[model samples]
Target: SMFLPPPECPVFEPSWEEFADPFAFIHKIRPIAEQTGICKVRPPPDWQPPFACDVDKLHFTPRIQRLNELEAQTRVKLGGGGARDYTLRTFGEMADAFKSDYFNMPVHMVPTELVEKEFWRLVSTIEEDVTVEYGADIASKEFGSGFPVRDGIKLSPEEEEYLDSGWNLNNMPVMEQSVLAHITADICGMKLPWLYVGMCFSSFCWHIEDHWSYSINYLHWGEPKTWYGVPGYAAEQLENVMKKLAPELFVSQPDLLHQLVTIMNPNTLMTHEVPVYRTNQCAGEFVITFPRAYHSGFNQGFNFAEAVNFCTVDWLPLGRQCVEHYRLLHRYCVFSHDEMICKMASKADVLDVVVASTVQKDMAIMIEDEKALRETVRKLGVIDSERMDFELLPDDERQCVKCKTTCFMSAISCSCKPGLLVCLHHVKELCSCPPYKYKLRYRYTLDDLYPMMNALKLRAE
Candidate 1:
C-alpha cells in the first residue's frame, strides 16, 4: 500500500527552430499543456546554456523545514532552527549523505516512486523526525543566478548567445507580451528570478503563483526535482479538498510571506477526484506551470534551480478574475491588476496587437462591472464622490480593510476613521458611520474610461 505514481504530465522535445521564440512556442502548446497543469520541455540536444559556478565560492542562508504532513503551517512553526551561511559544496555533501543514509542505498539507485512513497510514510510517522533545509531567495550578490549574466565579466560567444535567450529564467519576465513588464513598479519579488538550492527531502508547498500567473523553472544541474500539479480548472476543487482537511491553511495572512509549506499526499487529493499530474524534472530541462495551477514537490538530491513568474496576453482576463476572487477571500494581491491594465492602456500605441485586443475586451468587462458596483454603492446611499489617485498611495496604505484589495478604480472612505477604506462591494464594512457621511473615492470617471478602451481598440486594429 504505497504511493502509486500519478500519470506523467506532457513533455515536449522542441526542435532547435521551434525553440527560438519561447513565448510563441509556449502559446503553440497552450491548448495541450493547459490540460495537464504542468509540462516538461527538453531543449534541442545541443542547446545547452552554460551554468558556471564554484561550489565552494557560492553561499546562502538555509531555512529548515520539517517533513510534517498538513503541518499546521498557518499556525506556528513546529520545527526549524535558524542557520548561518552554508556553501554549495558543504550543502551538497550533507544532502547526499542524508538521502543515502535514509534509504540505505546509493542516492541515484533509489527509484523515484519509492522515494515519493517513503516521503509520505516518513512524514506521517510521528516517530520519524525528518527535517530538511534548503536555500531559497531572490537572486542577489551573495548567490547569483546559475545561468550566466552579462555583468562586467566578459563572456565567450557561447555565453553571449544564451545571455539573452528567452529560455533563460532571468530574461523571461521582461520579454515582449510578458505584461508584468509594463508595470511601473519594482515588484522585485514577482518580476525577478529566484534561486533554489535543494537537498534531499527539502520541499516547496502546494500553492499557485502570485496573481495566478505562469511560472517556468529550470534545473541548472544535479538531481531531479519531483513535481505534482493540478490544472487551473481544477484549482478550486483541490482547494476545497485541502481546506476540508487542513482548514488552518486558509486563514487570512498578514502579508506575502514567502515560505509557506503544506505537506499533503497527492493520493488524498486524487481520492477526492481532483486530476493530478506528475513529472520528474532533471537537470537542463524546464518545467512550466500554467496559470492558477497548484504545484508542490521535493528534491531527489542536491540540486539547483532558477525560476521566474510571468504573465502573457491571454492571462489578462484570468488575472482580473483572480483579483475579484482575492477580494471575496480577503487575500492580498501581489500587484494591482487594474493598475497594470491602465498603465498598458496609457502606452496603447506601443502595445502588442494581440495584447491590445485582449486588454480591450477586459476593459469592456471592467467598465460594465464598475458601473454595476458604483450603482450598487449608490443604492446603499454613498452619494459624495471625489477623484483620488489610488496608485499614488502606498500599497499597504490604500488596501480595503474588508477585502484586502489594492484599490485602483474606486473605494469608499469615511471621515469617521482617520485613514481607512472599503472597496465598493464592501462599502458597509468600513465603519459605524451613516451612509450619508461616506465618500466615494475614485481614480477615474466613467467618461474617462471610454477613451482608454478606445486607445486599445485602435491599437488592436
Candidate 2:
C-alpha cells in the first residue's frame, strides 16, 4: 500500500488584535445608536408586547393613524369591551390571526409552495406543538412567535401529517427570512430604516466581503466572542497575530482559523469544523446589515443557542439615478462591469468615433447622468442624506420610574443630554443596559416601537 502523507500545517493564525470590541461593535452598527445611542432603540414602556400582539405581529398590520388617533381609538375600543369581542377563542383562531396570516404574509404570497413545505418540515422536527404555538386557544389569544415548545406535547398522526405538507415557519433559515422580509416591505410600499437580530456563539470570525451597507448586532443570549477588522485595518497585523498564536486544538485537531471563517462565511468550499458551542442550547439572533455591511457568526458559548434576527433597509435611493450609480459601483467591485463614457462631439470627430465604437456609449451617458442627479439632490437638500432616523424620547414625554410622572429625574434635559438622539425633543431614553439585561418595560422611540406604543394606548403626560 502507498504510504499516507502527513497532515498539512495550518496556513493561517488569528490574534487578539484582529478581534472586535463586542460592546463597541453594537454601538457602531445600529441606526438608533447612530442617532441617539443611549435613548433610542428601546422596547416600549410596559413592554408586555405593548399590544394584544408583539412586534412581529404588529408589523403585519401596523397602526397607520397618528399617535393621538391611535390612543383615542384604543381607549374607545377598550371601553366598549373590545377584548371580549376580538379575543381569540380557539387555538385555530390564534393560529389564523397571528400564524396562518402573520409575518409570513410575504412567504404565503410566494408561488413556490415547496419552500413553505420545506420550512414547515424543518419546524415540525424542532417542535411538536407547532400548530398550537401558532394558534389562539390559550388565554393570551395570540400565537407564540419566540422559541419552540418542548417535546412533552403530543401531536397526533393527522396533525403531524398536516404540518408535514405545509410550510414550517421555524425551519425557515435566516437568509430566507431576510429575503421574505425584504420582499414584504417592498410590496407594502413601506420604507424600513434598519433590521436587527441578536446571537451568541463560541467564537466566530469572517473573511468578510466588503459591502456598502450598515448593520447592528446585539448579543442577548450570551457573551459574543468575535474577531473582526475593517478594510482599512491592516491585514498584515492580522496575519502576524495568527502566526504568533498556536492554532487552538478542538476535538484534538488544529486549524482554528479555518473553523472561524467556515462558520461565518455563507460560502465555503471544504467541510467546516462546527464549533462546540452549537451543540449546546442558547438563544440569540443575527442582525444582517445589507447594501454594504458584512459579518460572520459562531458560538461563543460551549453550547448550542438561539437569537432573534432583525432586518431593515438602511436607505432608499432618491431616484433611478442613485439606483443606477449603486448598481454600477457594485458591478465594478465584483469586476464584471466595464466603465464607460459619453462624448457630445459630432460622430465625425475621430477621437469621439474611436471611443464610441469601443465602449458602451449609452452606459456612459447613464452613469454621468446618475452622478449629476445625485449631486444635485445632495446640494438641494431634498432628502435626509444621513441614514440615522430614530429619535430619543424628550423630557415632556419621559415617565419617571418612581413617581410615574413626566419628571426630569428619569429624563435627559435639552441642555444636559448626550448627542446620540437626533430628534431628542420628544422621546425618552429606552434601554441603557447590556443586551442580556434588556428590559421591555422601558420608554420608546419613533422606530419599530411606535406601532406597539399606539396599540397599547401609550402617551406622554
Candidate 3:
C-alpha cells in the first residue's frame, strides 16, 4: 500500500573488456545518471568475485519491524525501519531460506514487477502480514573490506592481494581524479562500509545520503531487491511535493521531515511531474545512488548486500553547502566541513589535479565567507584575538555551542567565558558575553591559505 508501481531505472550491461577499469567505467556513467540519481550495472556473468563466508559462523542482531505500522515511527528511531524486527537465531534458517522451497518460486523466476506490487500491497494494508530482518555489520570489522583491517584480522594471501587491487573501495580514494573518498578520514559516518541482510518486506525508506555524498551498493547474492529513485537535482521538487501533501511533516522545530520521517506513495510524486525511476537489483549487480537523490526499496525475499558512502570532487562544494544548511537547522554535523577542506589543502601535493582544483575553488569561497563573517562580528563590537591553532586540537575538543557542529575554520570564543566556543554563524548565541568580549579562533590566515592553493594549482601543471 505504501509503494508505487515499479518504473525502470537506467541499467548498463558492460562487457568485461570495458569494465577492465572500474573507476573509468564509473566516471563514464557519472554524467548520464548522476542527475537522474541511480543506475544498475550488470557485469558479465563470469565476472563473479568470491564471497567466501561461513554462514553458520556469521552472527549479528537484527532490527525487527512489525508489518502495516506507520513507517514514520521507524524512520525517527532507527533512521529506517519500524519495531518487531529480530536477528537471525541461526545462520541455518537464513541459509535454508536461500533455497527455492522457502519462497515456493525460483529466485530468478520471481518477476520483480510482481514482487514490487505485492510489497506495496502488504505495507499499505492494515493487516500485519510480514516481518523483516537485516544485518548491520561493519565491513572492516567483520569480513575485512578491500582495505587492510586495522584490527589485525589475518587474511589469506588472495584476500590481501585483492584488498590492494585497484578495484577495491579502499583504493578508490587514492586513485587519480578521485577526491571525495580521500576526505573521509576527517569526516565521521562517511567511510565505514556496511553489510545488509534482507528478507521479504524488509524495506529502506526514501532518504538521501548524509551530506549529499554518493553511495554504491552491491548485492552479493539472493532474490532481486527492488528500488525506486528520484534524481539529485529534483531533490527540492520532491520535497515540495511532499510538503504540499503532508504539511504536518514540515512543522518547524520538530522538523521530522528533514530526517525523512514519512513515507508517501511514489505515484503522488510522479503525478506532480517529479521524475521517478526504478530497478530490481539482482546478485552480481552494482547500484550507484547519486548525491541528493532520494531512494527507497524492499527485498523480494532474503538477500545479502554491501554498501558504502563516498564523496567525489564534484561533491566538495555541495558538501560545504550541506554544512551551512545544517547550521540553519541547528543540526549536529558528523564532521567539520572546513576541517576536511583544510586537511586536504595541507596534503595538496598528493591530491588528484581535478580534486585539487575543486578544493582550491571551494577554499576560496570559504576564505571570502570567513572574511565577511569576521567583519560582521567586528562591526558588532567583537574583538579579534591572536589566531588559535584550532587544527592542533582534537576534533572532539571543539564544537559550536549552539549547533554542536565541529568547528575547524573559525569559531568565536570569549576570554570571560573560558573554555566555551561558538561557530562563526552562531557568534551571537554565546551566553551573557558581549560582542567585544568575544575573540575569533581560526586555523589559517588568508595569506597562508592562498599559498597552499597555489601549490596545488602548480602541481596540476
Considering every candidate listed, which one attains the maximal lDDT?
1
Lowest-scoring 10 consecutive residues by lDDT in candidate 1?
A: 73-82
Q: For candidate 1, what is the lDDT?
A: 0.88
Report the number of backbone clashes for model 1.
0
- Residue-level lDDT of model 1, residues 253-307, one tens digit each, is 6776633449888989999999999999999999999999999899988999989
Tell me the lDDT of model 2 at 3. 16
Query: Best TM-score goes to which candidate?
Result: 1
lDDT of 3 by residue, 1-461 (tens): 45556468889888877776766777788888876689998877656566676665555556665555235533423224443334333633653464346458766576777666666666677564565566555553333442343245577665665565444555554565555554544542456566677776677877888778888888877777888899988988998987777666554443322453455557778989889888888887889898899997778777788777777777888898888887776766666778778777888888777778888889889888988987887787877666787766666568787876778778888888788898877887886766777888878777888897787677666
Local distance difference test values of all predictions, in order: 0.88, 0.25, 0.71
Point out where model 3 deviates above 4 Å.
1-6, 67-70, 73-109, 140-161, 173-176, 184-188, 244-262, 392-397
What TM-score would each prediction reach against the true structure?
A: 0.96, 0.22, 0.85
